[PDB]
């Protein structure tokens, strides 16, 4: 990868970084009981529970309708419905344990239920508010009476209902195809995530990535309408390095020619893996210290001209007519600081001068040595390490791959081309 | 700017306003405190909430090291000195006698946001002595602080990138402390100005430069611009309509806002820029700079304008230009039920123009009112227009016409 | 619309399902009254019962400047609505005068011309439940405690949503939602269809009593007929070992007897219905719809970039897919079923597949979607378009080099 020669046509390629993928499907299950239990209601708070119950129908019924729709030609329609329903049938095998064990929650008040068949595979539950109801109990008994504890309960349940309706956001009746994230249900309780999301089974890797499952989504496989429970297929990853995998980043800072601030367009991220060469879509997936955690293999294919630009045949790099963003004008390359020195007047005060650039040379590097005090607006700064020249500086450069990016401009151009075709050999 | 023709071809120029920019970077540092007061030891639920608040700050403590990071680090390192300075005063002012008290010299302030709900707590206090319970006061206090926690968390739950960018913004912190700060937002900083722009402090962004896990406080460098006009730079703001042709309905697209200056202009983007009674406020001059062809379309050889196919909506019935009416009545048929007729069908036309003097009350699809109607507008001019800028937008359609041209040119270049 | 001839190029089409839209609107005016009047007692009152009032009402009432602009035309739809509200404002104020000091009658059903302004008072049901604490059980000072904190809570819930969505102002009045939202207009149609719908707006406001005035629309559902909504789901198919797909919208429909796209992003699915006021009929290229009409040999294409499972899916039990990115293993007997290079897919049917187990997932057959017949066609790869405009720019710039060097 020609990392260096690009840095006279406006690029920062940061560094290689590794990669990981969630190869397998390590899977435990969760279930919920959305009601809190009281030990004694001697005519205590039950209206608020009825209000919450009545409210929850709106959220819970579309879920049951969709879950009912999930079934294919049954073995007792769309793409991911296939894999979802197959996973539901594979959950039918543990339906036995689930349906045996659902009752122990209603039977007994408790915050988290840890009943499990085996040590490794365990299925657990959480009453929606019981962690706080164990201290809502005391205003009701032996601190105060219930007339206002019921009110406290009402406000608590309303906050919780909005806090669930945000993430199960009923934008559509058939919403179930959209993924509920692990983090809304993480926030379902406030201060039990660092316990259960690390303890649910053997989860060894540190807080940084494996305990940082942003992208992960969650199914729904059992919803009930009489005890008002939810069940969730909680996937879980298991990660290792992937081979020869080098993920770079890509910026594009302008080189202005004849007062035309243009820039090569490129993706956010570019990677390389032996012969593979493509700009992944990694917005969904995490930036780690030295290796990107993405479940899939996001590498794909691009225009041949872009690879030729990266491979080194830079005379095919496409220029682009723009009013650039605020970004592409100047930043630092690991000691070698680059700008566009025709617009911003890079001005070394040591030695004191405006810094000379010809219109021919797009931009020009000034390193640790040629000027310790590389001068721009706010320079009281540090200057240590290498940014290498290494481009046969100066050189002749071509332009013949310029482009326009907005469609209407292309429509204009091709309409001209139509008239020209109708004019050429008519 | 041949508005007398733009009225006749469909394009409109409504509400020309001014422009101003606060290109300056006046900053003052105003921070947080999250642990309010109590008398002889209440602590009735104050321990149930602070480990919880640490559970928030969990994903706020870390840090690590681009033409915006240079800013986000140069400001920070030039002010790391002032941060070290305010460390001492922070230590001094963590404990207080009142909610809202902090003092520094060097006229620039260091006045903190404040112990968050300590206003309402100073209201709450006088019940809790002589009228109420530790139990009831802690009840009130717990429900209040939990409200405040959720109201806080919605602004900023977390670090990880792109939350702080559309997170911590000063107006969202103002929304957080809204009940407290409605009166004194302007006064917290020394600068004073009219309601709209600087007193409003347009949707600015601020970055947390230091955080104290140990004492539950965040160090915020509040940015705070200084405004000044930009003269010989006005706006001729824009909105388009439908326009019939050959009994078919086409249109012409344009931006939502533009700007002119003396001899230059542009369709300036103003999403991050709030509109006002006479002059809107961009933080920096936009550069939505455009074709010579569309420049001519605007302010010259208007026959060089484009023309495109509506599909979504019937944009007419907002056909009101200086009291008059400008709409696509060749197809969206109209009526002057006084001065009675049905409005006619000039087939070359896409928009009639009907004056207040012509029709003393115009009908549309079936309603009848009148605006003023005595304004200022005129028209008598039929026109026939060149057709050499037909375009589209749908990339499929562009590609298909390109492949058609490929077929044609391949025939030709074999021939 | 021609599902049959489209099955052979990856198409799915879920079902015909009509539309049910809003055409009769039945505008209603609602006033919000505040400060729940204590039942006719004395000896209790506070200030933060009132503090928020100036606060919110002063945020709101200066929003009047942007109303006189009567001198996308929802501006004037709004204008006409406000004119009708102006016309009724007389009786609005008369009612408000009647109800204010009446300090009971939480909901009003006068019905002078149309249904009355209900004048939903904030809390008075709970306050009626509350009074018996405040009298014959305790003083009104424990009542002041409870009422202060509850009223503050109700205010905090107001401030969330004050372009309002009507379900939130419903959620203010948790019990009172379904009653009025059901029975204002006599709802003999499905209440649930009505529940889906959501706009609600303020027209003006009082500041001395601090009452908010709203102009609610609450329409009827008239089924349009001879028009059915379709869902669309395309998948891959292969050419020369190049996996290309067919771009199409999320939905299409057949208005009357003509065709066109469909935008039910606005609205909610049903079993035969799609509750959107607007009638999306967005015309698309005649070239495109030539295929949907049946002339398949002039369809567009595109290079694929997606996940895997859009490369296989069901059609009425019998599965359809590319047999190359997912090696078709019918258990008749379980073995790989490769294609001719001519084709891209194979419509595999009730031949021997009793219960297929491709990709490890064992499940059952008995296809019913008929036409167990493949597709021979022209080499019909004509419209090899590209989606992202960049590739088109470089393509035409190569074309520009070509024409410029060849024109000499």
């Amino acid at each position: 990868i020609d990392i260096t020669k690009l840095q006279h046509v406006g690029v920062l390629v940061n560094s290689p970084k590794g990669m990981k993928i969630s190869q397998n499907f390590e899977t435990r299950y969760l279930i919920l009981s959305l009601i809190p239990k009281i030990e004694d209601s001697n005519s205590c708070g039950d209206q608020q529970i009825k209000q919450y119950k009545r409210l929850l129908d709106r959220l819970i019924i579309p879920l049951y309708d969709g879950l009912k729709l999930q079934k294919d030609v049954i073995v007792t329609a769309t793409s991911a419905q296939i894999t979802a329903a197959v996973a539901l049938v594979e959950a039918k095998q543990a339906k036995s344990d689930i349906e045996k064990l659902k009752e122990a929650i209603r039977d007994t008040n408790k915050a988290v239920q840890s009943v499990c068949s085996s040590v490794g595979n365990c299925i657990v539950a959480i009453k929606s508010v019981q962690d706080y109801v164990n201290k809502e109990i005391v205003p009701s008994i032996a601190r105060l009476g219930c007339e206002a504890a019921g009110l406290q309960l009402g406000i608590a349940l309303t906050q919780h209902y909005s806090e669930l309706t945000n993430c199960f956001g009923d934008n559509i009746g058939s919403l179930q195809e959209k993924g509920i994230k692990l983090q809304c249900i993480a926030s379902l309780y406030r201060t039990n995530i660092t316990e259960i999301f690390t303890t649910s089974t053997v989860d060894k890797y540190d807080i940084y990535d494996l305990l940082f499952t942003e992208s992960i989504k969650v199914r729904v496989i059992d919803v009930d309408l009489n005890d008002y429970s939810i069940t969730l297929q909680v996937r879980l990853p298991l990660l290792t390095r992937l081979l020869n995998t080098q993920i770079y980043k890509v910026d594009s800072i302008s080189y202005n020619i004849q007062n035309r601030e243009w820039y090569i367009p490129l993706p956010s991220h570019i990677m390389t893996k032996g012969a593979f060469l493509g700009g992944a879509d990694v917005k969904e997936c995490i930036e780690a210290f030295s290796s990107y955690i993405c479940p899939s293999d996001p590498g794909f294919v691009l225009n041949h001209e872009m690879e030729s630009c990266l491979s080194g045949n830079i005379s095919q790099c496409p220029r682009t007519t723009v009013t650039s963003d605020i970004v592409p004008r100047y930043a630092f390359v690991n000691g070698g600081v680059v700008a566009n020195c025709i617009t911003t007047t890079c001005t070394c005060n040591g030695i004191g001068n405006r810094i000379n650039q010809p219109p021919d040379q797009g931009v020009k590097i000034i390193t640790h040595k040629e000027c310790n005090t590389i001068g721009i607006n706010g320079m009281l700064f540090n200057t240590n390490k290498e940014g290498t020249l290494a481009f046969y500086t100066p050189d002749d450069i071509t332009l013949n791959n310029s482009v326009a990016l907005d469609p209407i401009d292309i429509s204009i151009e091709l309409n001209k081309v139509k008239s020209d075709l109708e004019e050429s050999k008519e | 700017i041949d508005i007398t023709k733009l009225q006749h071809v469909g394009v409109l120029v409504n509400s020309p306003k001014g422009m101003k920019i606060s290109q300056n970077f006046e900053t003052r540092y105003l921070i947080l405190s999250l642990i309010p007061k109590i008398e002889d030891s209440n602590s009735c639920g104050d321990q149930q909430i602070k480990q919880y608040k640490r559970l928030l700050d969990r994903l706020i403590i870390p840090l690590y090291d681009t033409s915006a990071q240079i800013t986000a680090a140069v400001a920070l390192v030039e002010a790391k000195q002032a941060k070290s300075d305010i460390e001492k005063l922070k230590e001094a002012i963590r404990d207080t006698n009142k909610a809202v008290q902090s003092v520094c010299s060097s006229v620039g302030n260091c006045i903190v946001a404040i112990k968050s709900v300590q206003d309402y707590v100073n209201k709450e206090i006088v019940p809790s002595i002589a009228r109420l319970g530790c139990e009831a006061a802690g009840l009130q206090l717990g429900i209040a602080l939990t409200q405040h926690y959720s109201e806080l968390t919605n602004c900023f739950g977390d670090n990880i990138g792109s939350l702080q960018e559309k997170g911590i913004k000063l107006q969202c912190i103002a929304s957080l402390y809204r009940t407290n700060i409605t009166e004194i937002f302007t006064t917290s900083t020394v600068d004073k100005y009219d309601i709209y722009d600087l007193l409003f402090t347009e949707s600015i962004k601020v970055r947390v430069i230091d955080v104290d896990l140990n004492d539950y406080s965040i160090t915020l460098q509040v940015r705070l611009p200084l405004l000044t006009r930009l003269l010989n730079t006005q706006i001729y703001k824009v909105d388009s309509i439908s326009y019939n042709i050959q009994n078919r309905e086409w249109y012409i697209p344009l931006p939502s806002h533009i700007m002119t200056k003396g001899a230059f202009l542009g369709g300036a983007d103003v999403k991050e820029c709030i509109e006002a009674f006479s002059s809107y406020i961009c933080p920096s001059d936009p550069g939505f700079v455009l074709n010579h062809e569309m420049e001519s379309c605007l302010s010259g050889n208007i026959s060089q304008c484009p023309r495109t196919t509506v599909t979504s909506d019937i944009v007419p019935r907002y056909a009101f230009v200086n009291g008059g009416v400008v709409a696509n009545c060749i197809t969206t048929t109209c009526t002057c039920n006084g001065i009675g007729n049905r409005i006619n069908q000039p087939p070359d036309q896409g928009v009639k123009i009907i004056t207040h003097k012509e029709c003393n009350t115009i009908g549309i699809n079936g309603m009848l009112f009148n605006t003023n109607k005595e304004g200022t507008l005129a028209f008598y001019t039929p026109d026939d227009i060149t057709l050499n800028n037909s375009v589209a937008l749908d990339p499929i359609d562009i590609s298909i016409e390109l492949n058609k041209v490929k077929s044609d040119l391949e025939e030709s270049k074999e021939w | 619309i021609d599902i049959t001839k489209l099955q052979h190029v990856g198409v799915l089409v879920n079902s015909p399902k009509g539309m049910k839209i809003s055409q009769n609107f039945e505008t209603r005016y609602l006033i919000l009254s505040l400060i729940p009047k204590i039942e006719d007692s004395n000896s209790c009152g506070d200030q933060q019962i009132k503090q928020y009032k100036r606060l919110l009402d002063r945020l709101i009432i200066p929003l009047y400047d942007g109303l006189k602009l009567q001198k996308t035309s929802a501006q004037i739809t709004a204008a006409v609505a406000l004119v009708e509200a102006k016309q009724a404002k007389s009786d609005i104020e008369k009612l408000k005068e009647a109800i204010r000091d009446t300090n009971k009658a939480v909901q009003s059903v006068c019905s002078s011309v149309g249904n009355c302004i209900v004048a939903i008072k904030s809390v008075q049901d709970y306050v009626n439940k509350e009074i018996v604490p405040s009298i014959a059980r305790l003083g009104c000072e424990a009542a002041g405690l409870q009422l202060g904190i509850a009223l503050t809570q109700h205010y905090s819930e107001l401030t969330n949503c004050f372009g309002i969505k009507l379900q939130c102002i419903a959620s203010l009045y948790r019990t009172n939602i379904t009653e009025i939202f059901t029975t204002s207009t006599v709802d003999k149609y499905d209440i649930y269809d009505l529940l889906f719908t959501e706009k609600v707006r303020v027209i003006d406001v009082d500041l001395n009593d601090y009452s908010i005035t709203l102009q609610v629309r609450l329409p009827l559902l008239t089924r349009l007929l001879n028009t059915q909504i379709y869902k669309v789901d395309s998948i891959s198919y292969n050419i020369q070992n190049r996996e290309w797909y067919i771009p199409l919208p999320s939905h299409i429909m057949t208005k009357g007897a003509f065709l066109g796209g469909a935008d039910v992003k606005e609205c909610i699915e049903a079993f035969s219905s799609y509750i959107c006021p607007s009638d999306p009929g967005f015309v698309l290229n005649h070239e495109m719809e030539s295929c949907l009409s049946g002339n398949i040999s002039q369809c567009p294409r595109t290079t694929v970039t997606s996940d895997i499972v859009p490369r296989y899916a069901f059609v009425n039990g019998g599965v359809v897919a590319n047999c190359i990115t997912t090696t078709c293993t019918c258990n008749g007997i379980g073995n790989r079923i490769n294609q001719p290079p001519d084709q891209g897919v194979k419509i595999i049917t009730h031949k021997e597949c009793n219960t297929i187990g491709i990709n490890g997932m064992l499940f059952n057959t008995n296809k019913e979607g008929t036409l167990a017949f493949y597709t021979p066609d022209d080499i019909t790869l004509n419209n090899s378009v590209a989606l992202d405009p960049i590739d088109i720019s470089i393509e035409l710039n190569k074309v520009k080099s070509d024409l410029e060097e060849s024109k000499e």
């Epitope: 105060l144 | 002595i129 | 059980r137 305790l138």
Partner: antibody
Framework: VQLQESGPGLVKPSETLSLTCTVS????????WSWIRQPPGKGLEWIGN???????KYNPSLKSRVTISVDVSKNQFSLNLISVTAADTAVYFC???????????????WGQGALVTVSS | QMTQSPPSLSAYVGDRVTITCRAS??????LAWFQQKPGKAPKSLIY???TLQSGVPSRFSGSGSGTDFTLTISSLQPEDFATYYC?????????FGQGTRLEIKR
Amino acid sequence: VQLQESGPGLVKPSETLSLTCTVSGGSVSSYYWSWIRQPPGKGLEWIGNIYYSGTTKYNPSLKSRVTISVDVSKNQFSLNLISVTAADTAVYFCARQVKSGWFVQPFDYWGQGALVTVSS
Amino acid sequence: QMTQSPPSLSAYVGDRVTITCRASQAIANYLAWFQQKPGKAPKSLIYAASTLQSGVPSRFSGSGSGTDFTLTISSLQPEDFATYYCHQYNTYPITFGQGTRLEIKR
């Protein structure tokens, strides 16, 4: 007004106990009553209240042990508990008190003494 | 929770005599001083710290609020020879104190 107790004064351990208390005057059903006890030596321990609508509220120091009764016609009310140990050798007064503000307080109003002497 | 400053006071007739009950937790809402007299039936005396009951003389009065509270008496007589207590209402279990065995003299 006047309250007045009634019932036996001897109970063998881990048995049931129940004693009655009745007014002589006043007006029932308009407010509460309550029960207070103390050992003969030291202290004073609240047991629980009785409310005329059949509602009771108890000190969780004696949680899930006890029940208090209502009697609107005979104008009385009584106790019924099951874990009658020996360490509860005590006296069992009666309460009749009235509103004040925040929530309402029971105390000694009339009771001469419920002479309890449990034994083995 | 409550307590008692003296467990007894060997106070002879003809002096001011008082008390300092301190609330734990220190808090406002109020305490019903009542006298228990062994040998007869008790009764409640000072509801809400100065509103002494019907018919009790004005000799007793209560002065204070919050963290603690105190008495005010003069013109003593022997018939007030009975163990008093104090109280904490607004922590629902209806607390009391150890006791004040007054002892008149002479």
